[PDB]
Design a protein around this ligand. Structure first.
Ligand SMILES: [Hg+2]
Lengths: 128, 154
C-alpha cells in the first residue's frame, strides 16, 4: 500500500528532472520554505536556486528507478527514501545516481505541497 | 560513546562515526546493536546491475562478512551529511566499496549506506539504516585528493 504511493512519487520527482519545459514552478512547490539540498557535492538552501541551476545548466536527462527503499520515522512525521537510478544525457551511456529524500507523511494522505525537505542527489558511477 | 556525535563544520564527526561503525560492522556487528532501539529500522536491497535490535540483529548475522577500507583508501568513498531538523538529528550517507566474501571467494562490491541518526546519551541512536549493495564500480567522485569526498548541508 504505502509502498506504491512512495515509489510513484519517487517517479513523479524523477519525471520533473526530465521535463525540459521551463513551465517547473509547481515542481518547486514540492519543496517547503526551509530545505537541505545537495547536488553532486553542492549545497543549495533554496530549491529555487537549485532548480534554476538545473533548468539553466543541466542537460536533457532520462532517469530510471532501479531500487527504492524507505523508512517512516516515528514522531518525526516524515519518511526517508534511499533511491537508485541510472541516467542518460544526449541518449548516451547510463550513469549511476544515488538519491536520498526526506518526505512528509502528508503525501500518503495525498498531500503534495512542499513535502521534500531532504534532497541528497549524487552521481555514484559512470560508463565503465 | 565512541559514537559521540558533534556536528562540527569540519565533518570530522561524520567521519569518526562512519569509521567506527564500519570497523565494528566488519569485526563485531553484535556490538552495533547498542546503537539500535526498539523502534530502529534496517533495510537492504540489491540493484539491478526489519525492526528492533532483535530482527535487526538477526539479519546482521545473516549478511556476508565484509571488509571496508575507509581509513586506508579514503579517496574510494564519498560522504554527505544533512540535518534532520524534524528529529533533531542528522542523515549520514556513505558511498563506496567493500570486499565481499558464499563461493568462499573475495569480490569487490559498491554500495550506498544511509544512516539516520539522533544524537543522545553522549552518543547516537540509529533511527534508520538503509543499505543498498550494488555491482562494484569506480566512484564517479574521485579526485587527486587522497581523502573522503565530503559534503554537508543544513
Ligand atoms: Hg527550501
Amino acid at each position: 500500500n504505502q509502498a506504491q504511493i512512495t515509489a510513484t512519487f519517487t517517479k513523479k520527482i524523477l519525471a520533473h528532472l526530465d521535463d525540459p519545459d521551463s513551465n517547473l514552478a509547481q515542481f518547486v512547490q514540492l519543496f517547503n520554505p526551509n530545505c537541505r539540498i545537495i547536488f553532486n557535492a553542492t549545497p543549495f538552501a533554496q530549491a529555487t536556486v537549485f532548480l534554476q541551476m538545473w533548468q539553466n545548466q543541466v542537460v536533457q536527462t532520462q532517469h530510471a528507478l532501479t531500487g527504492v527503499d524507505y523508512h517512516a520515522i516515528p514522531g518525526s512525521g516524515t519518511l526517508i527514501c534511499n533511491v537508485n537510478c541510472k541516467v542518460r544525457f544526449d541518449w548516451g551511456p547510463y550513469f549511476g545516481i544515488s538519491l536520498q529524500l526526506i518526505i512528509d507523511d502528508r503525501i500518503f494522505r495525498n498531500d503534495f505541497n512542499g513535502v521534500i525537505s531532504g534532497f541528497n542527489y549524487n552521481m555514484v558511477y559512470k560508463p565503465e | 560513546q565512541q559514537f559521540f556525535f558533534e556536528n562540527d563544520a569540519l565533518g570530522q564527526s561524520s567521519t569518526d562515526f562512519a569509521t567506527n561503525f564500519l570497523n565494528l560492522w566488519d569485526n563485531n556487528r553484535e556490538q552495533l546493536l547498542n546503537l539500535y532501539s526498539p523502534q530502529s529500522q534496517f533495510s537492504v536491497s540489491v540493484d539491478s546491475t526489519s525492526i528492533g535490535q532483535e530482527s535487526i540483529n538477526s539479519i546482521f548475522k545473516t549478511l556476508p562478512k565484509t571488509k571496508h577500507h575507509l581509513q586506508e583508501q579514503p579517496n574510494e568513498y564519498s560522504m554527505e551529511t544533512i540535518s534532520y531538523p524534524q528529529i533533531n538529528g542528522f542523515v549520514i550517507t556513505l558511498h563506496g566499496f567493500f570486499e565481499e566474501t558464499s563461493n568462499n571467494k573475495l569480490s569487490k562490491k559498491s554500495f550506498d549506506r544511509t544512516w539516520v541518526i539522533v544524537p543522545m546519551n553522549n552518543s547516537v541512536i540509529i533511527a534508520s539504516d538503509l543499505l543498498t549493495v550494488r555491482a562494484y564500480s569506480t566512484g564517479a567522485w574521485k579526485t587527486a585528493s587522497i581523502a573522503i569526498a565530503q559534503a554537508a548541508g543544513s
